[PDB]
Write a protein that binds this ligand. Structure first.
Ligand code: CD4
Ligand code: BCL
Ligand code: BCL
Ligand code: BCL
Ligand code: BPH
Ligand code: V7N
Ligand code: V7N
Ligand code: V7N
Ligand code: V7N
Ligand code: LMT
Ligand code: LMT
Ligand code: LMT
Lengths: 39, 62, 60, 52, 73, 55, 174, 49, 273, 60, 58, 39, 39, 58, 58, 39, 39, 39, 56, 39, 39
């Protein structure tokens, strides 16, 4: 399987990858909102 | 008299009750082999609980 | 007459009886509910003289 | 496939057993009284349809 | 049954009375495919009821037609 | 009444007296389909019942 | 070890990994019903259902077909594994259940279920050898043995069929 | 008279009687409100026209 | 959870694409690479069906109707609200059904089984592909596919039948129906024989292969044998779907008149013209 | 928080997550492309004052 | 009369009773809901004299 | 299975639950009756 | 099966329960008749 | 009363109950959402006297 | 309350919970998106005074 | 179940509660009669 | 399976959770009735 | 299965996860209510 | 970041990726090809001001 | 599987492959934009 | 369950809490009567 150390190492990549993806999506929504707001 | 209720609707819900009763019966029969299940948390029966293992007697030639 | 329970297992007969009565009761209720005279959910508050009656002979 | 066995005396203890499984006769294709009458009645039905 | 015939799966009565590996593989294929399985006996009950219910439900549909409902649409 | 009022100065549609930014359209479900209410409504759109047979 | 397999890892749905030789241990597609009754299958009249054909002179080859007895058996690695000595027949539904092969190397006779064998042209012509696609000629030496050589138990039927069933996955495994 | 209670569980007795009294009291009030015109006269006294 | 004999069989191997990467279980279900693609196509296709219901007139289960495009769009992808959504769902369905057959092949390989089940299921996929791909392509518009709706597809079947005035006269349809009806009889017969030897009347020994062979021979006048009845059932059930695929693909691409007047060739055989 | 990766195999949580996001992204794009206001392939060049807005029928 | 719980397994009978009551109550509610007089979700706030009644004999 | 001692204990609860259920149902019927009589 | 002694005991309940059911059905018919006679 | 949990495994009962309540809640909400009076997504902002009422007796 | 995680394996409950919430969220969004009042992709820029309302009682 | 001495003790409270209940109900009826007599 | 001690412990949780759920449902019905009465 | 220590450790994350999710949902509902109230 | 190839055997990921991109590219092209604005096989020679717009 | 050293070697080509693909697509989009803008 | 010792303590608090409840309710009704009398 994996150790806590390997789990903790993977978790760091997973958390940062998730937040990075959410940042890119946040900018995409900013662009979409500027083009054609939905509210 | 009853407008929305009619005999074809009555008959159909009678069939549905029979049919779900039959599916339950068949799933009990499906569990006479291989059950109870093994699991990490212990034995499991699912649902419905299976019918028991069945013993067969063979024609005596003695 | 009690000897008939040697002839038939009462654990079988009790289930068969209850099933027979439950079906028969539902059949009679729904037959009446489908009639005009006895459609009691819609017309149950009508008095007996107000209740429907099926057509009589015209004596032709 | 293509290594068929062929059994000269009767299987069921190509060919077929003449014998009994208790009340049941083995050998001929079973009719009994109900089967014979069924074929007679059914034949007349088929004949009436075809002749019409 | 043809997929396990190499292992004697077509001898279904033996597989019902004395479960072989052919029965076990038959059960596991369907369990692994769709999440539930029958047994070598009870698959014949599923078969029996599906055939029988074809003509039984059909007959009720005919008896209702023109007696209870005159226009099904 | 099939369209909302239009402000003649801006050309904007007015909904409940207040302007909408955009070109307004009336929403409808796929191809304008509408659920059939009941048998009586379906029969109200048909021809009358056929006359009795000539026997 | 007495355990035939261990989990690949600690997660719930993980596969098992065999410890020893899986064809011999009976793991994966090489496994058999280990609880199966160790007695012969019987006919309606109570005789043994599957028997070598010499034990019942009622049975013969259909006169158009080749008798396979004497022919060489060719294993998956294209070696000769042996020759067919005898046929075993099902007396309830008359057919050949097993060929019996005397091994070419060594001395033992082993059973070989039909349906693992095939003819070079599926019977159509040239019926001079038998093909066993599933196992190599060395693996023929370990085919499970019946405790008598005129009779086979339901457990022995399962073990033998399971050995050839495992071959497609394991015959060339390291 | 107390011999009637022998073999019973007292909590079963109090559950049975407790159920019955709640049921009877509710039925009696639902009935009484229809007959006595109360609280309908109360509501009419404080209603806004 | 596992059957009491199951754990022994859960080995690696027999996959087609993914190697060991997806070679695992999730509850009872085997996954594998085509498990992953199955769930992808199943989820996408189902959510687009729910979207088609949402933009349609009602949520009533029976009345939901995702229709194909108008014939004017030919073999193009129409606007999504105009029937392009039906076209996306159709691609998802093909992906799901194909993935399901390949996943079954991995399961059969892992168990040392023959490939009979994947190939039998291929008969159903063939019939679906004929209805939504091959026949629409031969007619030149995807709009010839059937709508996705529990009763609205029965309206399609009705109207396609009457496009040929009297579809009962379709000769391939007559064969396909005969296979379906013969299959159902054969299933009742085989199911009854196995059950009646394994469940004899109370106080009677368990029956034998010989008894079902005797009785079956009284029923049909020949003995089919244990493997033969399963070959027959597979032949009848799959042959029904194959003749179904034929009967619909000849209607329109190859024959365009009423089906009754197809029989004119039989009336004009020269022995009796 | 990282002990979640002791409960579940990261190699197949990550497959399930990537698959989920792929389905969700495609669903949202097809939903928007089905709409009138966000049919961007046909009407993406319209300015926001020209973009469609759906309303109910006037209740006259 | 308690010997019914020896005659039958109470675990099984009690599930059968729960299933029977479940189905029976749902049948009666849906029959009433699709009547005219007792379609309480649409018309429950009508007074007893305002509620629909079936037609009398002519 | 059950002993006959358990069977009598069980029957006491089964009767008391049956009575409670009949009480609730009869209140429900009299509420329904007062709102919209069916006879 | 069961003994003739058990059969007599069961029969006594079964007859009494049957007659009880018929008595309750008699009252239901009395009430139905006085509501809306069918002859 | 607690001896009911000797007759039935509480782990099984809670799954059965949670499944029952989920289905029952969804059924009741969909029934109401299908009605005229309680189509609350379309009409929830109407006052109680403005909300639909089914037809009376004539 | 952590007692509950001895009766049920966390790994199974979290799978159940994720599945239930994913489906429930998708149900509610599609139901709203199918309505007139909350079809926000077409009409989300309307003000609350401009949004559709279902028909009242006459 | 409950023994004779338990039953004897239980009965004393049971009668007392019943009489207390009937006393309260009697006062309620006297008040009701003085407010809106029903015969 | 459970000891009767375990069963009695679970019963306490089970009854409390049931009545807690019924209480929350009571407040939901109070709010629903105050918004749009069904009788 | 778990140790009871691991049950405690897991439960704390579960409470915070449930709470944080309910908070996000509560803000989401109040945004929706402010834009287009449903009662 | 390279360790993703220890989790996922790259020889397989390339084949899945290529497959996914191939299908995605085809779907996008067919969506465009049968739109009004981008049916370039029929109207590709129109200038940007002559190209259709899906005004309601 | 491969070693971490092989993974670092393979990952280098995978970046340049991806970058080259993104570059070609970026040119393809700007050509398409120049011909017929979508916003 | 409770011992007779626990029951004797519990009863005293239950009786006291009930009396506090009834007293506070009595004040509530006296105020309500003085505000809007209902007979
Ligand atoms: C129930 C009380 C009321 C009764 C009255 C009304 C209903 C009457 C029918 C009752 C049938 C039993 C229901 C049940 O609880 O089953 C549990 C069992 C699971 O296997 P098990 O052996 O019993 O248990 C093992 C398991 O507990 C422990 O192992 P593990 O932990 O590894 O298992 C994971 C679990 C998780 O459990 C679940 O997820 C249960 C899911 C139940 C889904 C039912 C959906 C029904 C509505 C669909 C609406 C549609 C949604 C799209 O187990 C699983 O992974 C689940 C494996 C089964 C997968 C079933 C796939 C779909 C089956 C067909 C659906 C119907 C198609 C028409 O699952 C099954 O056996 C389901 C399939 C059996 C029925 C197939 C019937 C097909 C009839 C087709 C003809 C229709 C003609 C009109
Ligand atoms: C273990 C305790 C016993 C029991 C012992 C008592 C005692 C002692 C008293 C009552 C009282 C009552 N009980 Mg109780 N009761 C039991 C079970 C029930 C059940 C049931 C669903 O099983 C019901 C419907 C009832 C119903 C009733 C009412 C008729 C009445 C007061 C209202 C009420 O219900 O409050 C409670 C609501 C519930 C849902 C029941 C829960 C249990 C509560 C704690 C019982 C009330 C105790 C009460 C506050 C004590 C006050 C003492 C004063 C000296 C009067 N009981 C259980 C089995 N019940 C009182 C009475 O007779 O008034 C006429 C009373 O003095
Ligand atoms: C335009 C035509 C109508 C239509 C009209 C009907 C009618 C009318 C009927 C059916 C019936 C059936 N239809 Mg339909 N059907 C249509 C469209 C379809 C479609 C489709 C894809 O569109 C399908 C798959 C079906 C399928 C079916 C079956 C499910 C069902 C027959 C079951 C069965 O086994 O019968 C075959 C089995 C039998 C007939 C039993 C025979 C048993 C006896 C004992 C055999 C005796 C043999 C005898 C001894 C041999 C000698 C005889 C002499 C030579 C004379 N219908 C459309 C909508 N369909 C039947 C049904 O049940 O309806 C509810 C029915 O009556
Ligand atoms: C016209 C009617 C009169 C009036 C007449 C009377 C009379 C007469 C009496 C009372 C009594 C009470 N009144 Mg009053 N009362 C009025 C107006 C009010 C108002 C107000 C307007 O804000 C309030 C807060 C109260 C409050 C109260 C209580 C202090 C008391 C009952 C206590 C009890 O046990 O409650 C128990 C109930 C609760 C705790 C439920 C509260 C529910 C809350 C609002 C919502 C919770 C939601 C949440 C999600 C639930 C989670 C559950 C957990 C997760 C498990 N009244 C008006 C002016 N009231 C009685 C009293 O004094 O008793 C001692 C009494 O006799
Ligand atoms: C579960 C539903 C399905 C079903 C089941 C089913 N059918 C069955 C059975 C079962 C389980 C039987 O056991 C029974 C049977 O025998 O099967 C072989 C049968 C059967 N299903 C039949 C047909 C049939 N089943 C159909 C359908 C179905 N069967 C459903 C799909 C259909 C359709 C689709 O239309 C048909 C046509 C028969 C083959 C058979 C019943 C045979 C029967 O009743 O025969 C009666 C007799 C005659 C017709 C007369 C024959 C006359 C001879 C040809 C004359 C020759 C001369 C004669 C010798 C003269 C007399 C001299 C005397 C001295 C002898
Ligand atoms: C029509 O409108 C409708 C649709 C109806 C409206 C409704 C919509 C709804 C309901 C939407 C819901 C959305 C949702 C809900 O949660 C959405 C949730 C989304 C989430 C959580 C996204 C998460 C993304 C995470 C990513 C991308 C992670 C990437 C990680 C990377 C790259 C690192 C990998 C690891 C490495 C490299 C380390 C190896 C080293 C190792 C091993 C070592 O060193 O050992
Ligand atoms: C057409 O008509 C239509 C429209 C359909 C209308 C008609 C509808 C109808 C007929 C409806 C009928 C409804 C009905 C009928 O009875 C409804 C019955 C409902 C019921 C019974 C609900 C019960 C809920 C109980 C709950 C929620 C319990 C929760 C328990 C909790 C939280 C604690 C769990 C344990 C813990 C935490 C720790 C344990 C300890 C351990 C492990 C330890 O210590 O080890
Ligand atoms: C209708 O409109 C709708 C469709 C609805 C709108 C929505 C659309 C949506 C949602 C789109 C989503 C797009 C998307 C999302 O992720 C798209 C993601 C795209 C991606 C990631 C593309 C990546 C491409 C990478 C390539 C090509 C790499 C090539 C590598 C090469 C050539 C080198 C190989 C290695 C070598 C040679 C070395 C061997 C050495 C070895 C072995 C050694 O040395 O050992
Ligand atoms: C409008 O129309 C219709 C509706 C029809 C009109 C009609 C309505 C009707 C009929 C109403 C009837 C109402 C009614 C009838 O009875 C109402 C009955 C009300 C009652 C009884 C209320 C009782 C309240 C009791 C309380 C608050 C007690 C609290 C006690 C506490 C806090 C202490 C707990 C214990 C401790 C601390 C000891 C631990 C020691 C231990 C463990 C140890 O020592 O070991
Ligand atoms: C692949 C992950 C997603 C990258 C997406 C690109 C945008 C986001 C910025 C990435 C910047 C670097 O991001 C950071 O990388 C380091 C390693 O370099 C990760 O570090 C991780 O692994 C290292 C060892 O390799 C551990 O000691 C550490 O505990 C663990 O968190 C961090 O968890 C991540 O936050
Ligand atoms: C709605 C209520 C009013 C109408 C319905 C009345 C229903 C019938 C109630 C009958 C109750 C008493 O019924 C009577 O019970 C006793 C035991 O108590 C039964 O007696 C039973 O056990 C005794 C020994 O214990 C045997 O000797 C006897 O043969 C056996 O039947 C009687 O056979 C039955 O007649
Ligand atoms: C779609 C909307 C979803 C909204 C969900 C909102 C969930 C909000 C967080 C609560 C749930 C997760 O649980 C929360 O995880 C974070 C992750 O940083 C933990 O955060 C903290 O603890 C962990 C573990 O020691 C540290 O590694 C971390 O650096 C520290 O910030 C919190 O202690 C925990 O309470």
């Amino acid at each position: 399987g994996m150790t806590e150390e390997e789990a903790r190492r993977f978790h760091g990549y997973m958390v940062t990858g998730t937040l990075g993806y959410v940042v890119v999506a946040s900018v995409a929504h900013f662009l979409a909102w500027s083009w054609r707001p939905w509210f | 008299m009853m407008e929305y209720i009619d005999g074809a609707q009555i008959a159909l819900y009678a069939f549905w009750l029979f049919f779900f009763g039959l599916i339950i019966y068949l799933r009990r029969e499906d569990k006479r082999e291989g059950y109870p299940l093994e699991s990490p948390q212990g034995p499991r029966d699912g649902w419905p609980k299976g019918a028991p293992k069945k013993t067969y007697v063979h024609r005596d030639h003695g | 007459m009690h000897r008939i329970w040697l002839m038939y297992d009462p654990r079988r007969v009790m289930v068969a009886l209850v099933g027979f009565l439950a079906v028969l009761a539902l059949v009679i209720h729904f037959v009446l509910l489908s009639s005009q005279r006895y459609s009691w959910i819609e017309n149950g508050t009508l008095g007996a003289d107000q209740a429907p009656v099926g057509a009589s002979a015209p004596a032709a | 496939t293509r290594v068929q066995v062929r059994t000269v005396p009767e299987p069921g203890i190509f060919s077929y057993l003449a014998g009994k499984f208790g009340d049941a006769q083995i050998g001929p294709i079973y009719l009994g009284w109900a089967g014979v009458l069924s074929l007679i009645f059914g034949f007349i039905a088929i004949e009436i349809i075809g002749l019409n | 049954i043809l997929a396990v015939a190499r292992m004697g799966g077509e001898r279904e009565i033996e597989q019902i009375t004395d479960r072989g590996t052919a029965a076990e593989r038959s059960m596991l294929f369907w369990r692994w495919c769709m999440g539930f399985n029958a047994t070598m006996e009870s698959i014949h009950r599923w078969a029996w009821w599906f055939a029988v219910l074809t003509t039984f439900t059909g007959g009720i549909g005919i008896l209702l037609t023109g007696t209870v409902v005159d226009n099904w649409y | 009444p099939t369209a909302w009022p239009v402000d003649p100065t801006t050309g904007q549609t007015l909904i409940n007296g207040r302007p909408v930014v955009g070109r307004v359209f009336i929403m409808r479900k796929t191809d304008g389909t509408v659920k059939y209410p009941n048998v009586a409504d379906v029969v109200a759109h048909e021809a009358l019942a056929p006359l009795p047979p000539v026997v | 070890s007495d355990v035939k397999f261990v989990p690949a890892d600690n997660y719930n749905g993980s596969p098992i990994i065999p410890t020893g030789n899986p064809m011999i241990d009976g793991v994966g597609p090489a496994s058999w019903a280990e609880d199966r009754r160790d007695e012969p299958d019987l006919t309606y009249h109570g005789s043994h259902k599957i028997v070598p054909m010499r034990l019942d002179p009622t049975f013969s080859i259909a006169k158009g077909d080749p008798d396979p007895r004497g022919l060489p058996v060719i294993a998956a690695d294209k070696q000769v594994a042996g020759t067919v000595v005898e046929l075993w027949v099902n007396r309830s539904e008359p057919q050949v259940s097993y060929y019996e092969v005397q091994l070419a190397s060594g001395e033992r006779r082993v059973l070989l279920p039909t349906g693992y064998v095939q003819w070079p042209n599926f019977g159509l012509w040239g019926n001079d050898k038998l093909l066993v696609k599933s196992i190599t000629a060395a693996q023929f030496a370990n085919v499970p043995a019946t405790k008598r050589d005129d009779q086979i138990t339901l457990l022995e039927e399962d073990k033998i069929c399971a050995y050839y069933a495992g071959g497609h996955m394991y015959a060339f495994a390291e | 008279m107390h011999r009637i209670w022998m073999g019973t569980d007292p909590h079963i007795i109090m559950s049975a009687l407790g159920s019955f009294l709640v049921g009877a009291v509710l039925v009696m009030h639902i009935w009484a409100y229809g007959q006595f015109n109360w609280p309908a006269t109360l509501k009419a006294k404080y209603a806004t026209p | 959870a596992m059957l009491s004999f199951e754990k022994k069989y859960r080995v690696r191997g027999g996959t087609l694409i993914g190697g060991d990467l997806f070679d695992f279980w999730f509850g009872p279900f085997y996954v594998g690479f085509f498990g992953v693609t199955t769930i992808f196509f199943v989820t996408l296709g189902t959510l687009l069906c729910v979207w088609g219901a949402a933009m349609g007139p009602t949520w009533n289960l029976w009345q939901i109707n995702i229709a194909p495009p108008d014939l004017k769009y030919g073999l193009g992808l129409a606007p999504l609200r105009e029937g392009g959504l039906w076209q996306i769902i159709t691609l998802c369905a093909l992906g799901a059904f194909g993935s399901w057959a390949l996943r079954q092949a991995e399961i059969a390989r892992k168990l040392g089984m023959g490939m009979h089940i994947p190939w039998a299921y291929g008969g159903a996929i063939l019939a679906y592909t004929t209805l939504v791909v091959i026949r629409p392509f031969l007619l030149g518009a995807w709009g010839h596919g059937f709508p996705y709706g529990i009763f609205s597809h029965l309206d399609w079947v009705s109207n396609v039948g009457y496009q040929y005035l009297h579809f009962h006269y379709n000769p391939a349809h007559m064969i396909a129906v005969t296979f379906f009806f013969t299959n159902c009889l054969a299933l009742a017969m085989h199911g009854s024989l196995i059950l009646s030897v394994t469940n004899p009347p109370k106080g009677t020994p368990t029956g034998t292969s010989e008894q079902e062979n005797v009785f079956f021979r009284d029923l049909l006048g020949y003995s089919i044998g244990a493997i033969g009845i399963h070959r027959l059932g597979l032949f009848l059930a799959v042959g029904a779907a194959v003749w179904s695929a034929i009967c619909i693909v000849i209607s329109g691409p190859f024959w365009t008149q009423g089906w009754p007047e197809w029989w004119n060739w039989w009336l004009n055989l020269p022995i009796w013209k």
